[PDB]
Amino acid sequence: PKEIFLVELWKKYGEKAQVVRVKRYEDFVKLKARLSGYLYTIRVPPDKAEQLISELKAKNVKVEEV
Amino acid sequence: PRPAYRSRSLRRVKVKTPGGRTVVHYEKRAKGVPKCAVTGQPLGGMNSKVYRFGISTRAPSRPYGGVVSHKVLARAIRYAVRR
């Protein structure tokens, strides 16, 4: 598993993800793109998390709450 | 296996697992770093710890790279320039 910090970098992997898992906390949300090779995790603020899940569902990537 | 672990060729590492157990992992020791062909000292930029063979290492950007140090290279270049 690999960790990314920049949303712009992380979107390149998340857009090709087989699934995007979402884990929520009081201050931040972990978004985990599961690809064939790696699991890319990014911790984002909740509002940016909502925007990224909306964009991913727009691109028709599967999203699951874990 | 067991006599291979009784020998001290591998490192005995004790680790606590997420299951609450303590286990001993037998891990390899690091390989020696490259040395200068004249002085035998470790070469700068190539002395990171490596634990297995077949890992490509990037030499410093200089003529002769990870073969001789900058001191030997500079002195040899001076001798050749005069000679």
């Binding site: 960790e3 910090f5 920049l6 949303v7 970098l9 201050d27 931040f28 911790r43 984002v44 603020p45 | -």
Partner: protein
């Protein structure tokens, strides 16, 4: 400071026009600052963590990185909690 090599690599890549490498170097610089600060705070070396966080604030101002500000805010919240516990116990 600690991630000055990352700053120099970022500017060198941007001058050379390597946008992909510039993005990778920005990610590496953020990783440098956030990982070092988080390890310092977990070990409770708050003075070193505060110096790293001030440097990260300057770097985020210099490079326009929002994720650095967000993670710095989380770390400063943790530092405030640690200092509050220390003051209460002492």
């Amino acid at each position: 400071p600690l991630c000055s090599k990352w700053e120099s690599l970022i500017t060198w890549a941007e001058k050379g026009g390597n946008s992909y490498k510039a993005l990778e170097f920005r990610e590496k610089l953020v990783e440098c600052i956030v990982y070092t600060a988080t390890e310092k705070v977990k070990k409770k070396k708050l003075d070193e963590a505060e110096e790293l966080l001030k440097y990260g604030k300057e770097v985020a101002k210099k490079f326009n990185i929002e994720e650095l500000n967000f993670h710095i805010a989380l770390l400063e919240k943790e530092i405030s909690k640690i200092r509050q516990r220390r003051a209460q116990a002492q």
